[model samples]
Target: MPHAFKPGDLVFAKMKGYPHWPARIDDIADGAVKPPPNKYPIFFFGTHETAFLGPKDLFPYDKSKDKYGKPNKRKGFNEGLWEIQNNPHASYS
Candidate 1:
């Protein structure tokens, strides 16, 4: 099947040793020169970091069902979301 997400979709991404963090789908990795199998390019919210994650590491973000609890404010997750909300097109680096 095709990937479950596309560019611009908001999601929660899991990284080893950390909780699921909010992120945005940056792109799909289905080019001629492909990425690792089934990996999706993602931009992390709080840290403004980017990585290629697979479906097992991603989940739909649900405000009502915030199973992961709030992300670490000190880690910049909240700030990251704030910046994105204010200017989606601005570079977060």
Candidate 2:
């Protein structure tokens, strides 16, 4: 069976042409126009972006190795990273 995910779960989401990014599952798609089975809407952490992705593109987030590395740190990195790690369900405000 495909990996099961639910709203508010912190996971690594990878969209086509983009690297895996830390994100939180916002909601599952439903109804006629929804995404394919096993797909979910995810809110990206650092960028506050949103997208639909499937289980194949989602993985359990690893705090130690999945965070922003030292060499590539950017402005607001700490705040964003900390939020994702500590409060994955908070709104981007």
Candidate 3:
């Protein structure tokens, strides 16, 4: 199995769709940030034009429970190191 990452852990994350700076995982999730497509919680720090971070474009893994209270399923990473190196972010992209 691939390694999983949690909040506050030092990781190299990025938005799955938009090309942006390397992610320095944050502890607090941004209220303004919308949940990603898979609905996994995501927290990110600011850097450049991509000053905000949210879902659908984010990757790591979708651990959010469905309405049924079970974690979402997965396939593999689609892009970047996390996707290529690890389980990748949860996204169709």
Candidate 4:
């Protein structure tokens, strides 16, 4: 099936690990993160899936660290998604 989106289409999604953050469709890049285009396939809230992020899981997420890490990595980052939960107690950190 076709991917669920358009260039300017507004959408709400969730994060990967934290299922309480919310995200917005910032932009859509084509191709993968390699030669020829240097991009990545699939949807992203800067980079998450959907319905599982707060306003904290937005990239660029630290690849080396994570929740309970140095900066109390227990925060949420928005990685672009299409189904995030509207939790009331959600916080980035």
Task: Give the per-residue lDDT of model 4 (tens digit) for 1-93.
Answer: 534433332233323554423333334336623222332222333234323223233332222124311221333333222223233222322
> Can you give the lDDT of residue 50 in candidate 1?
84
- Among all windows of 10 consecutive residues in model 2, the one with the lowest summed lDDT is 63-72
Q: What TM-score would every model get versus the actual structure?
A: 0.69, 0.66, 0.27, 0.23
State each candidate's clash count.
2, 0, 7, 34
As for lDDT, the candidate ahead, 1 or 2, is: 1
**Which candidate leads in TM-score?**
1
Please give, for residues 1-93, the per-residue lDDT of candidate 3 as tens digits. 745444433233345453332333343346646444434343332221123344434444233212112221322212232432343233322
Best-to-worst ranking by TM-score: 1, 2, 3, 4
Tens-place lDDT per residue, model 1, 1-93, is 445677776777889987677777785346634457778777887688888888788786654126754546457767765644555445565
What tens-digit string does per-residue lDDT give for candidate 2 at 1-93? Answer: 534687887776767755556677886446525556667877787778677887777777764333532222544444556766678777674
Worst 10 residues of 1 by lDDT: 62-71
> Candidates' lDDT values, in order?
0.69, 0.66, 0.34, 0.31
User: Is 1 or 4 the stronger prediction by TM-score?
Assistant: 1
Instruction: State residue 28's C-alpha deviation in candidate 1, in Å.
Output: 6.6
**Residue runs of model 2 more than 4 Å from their true location after superposition:** 1-3, 28-37, 62-79
Model 1 clash count equals 2
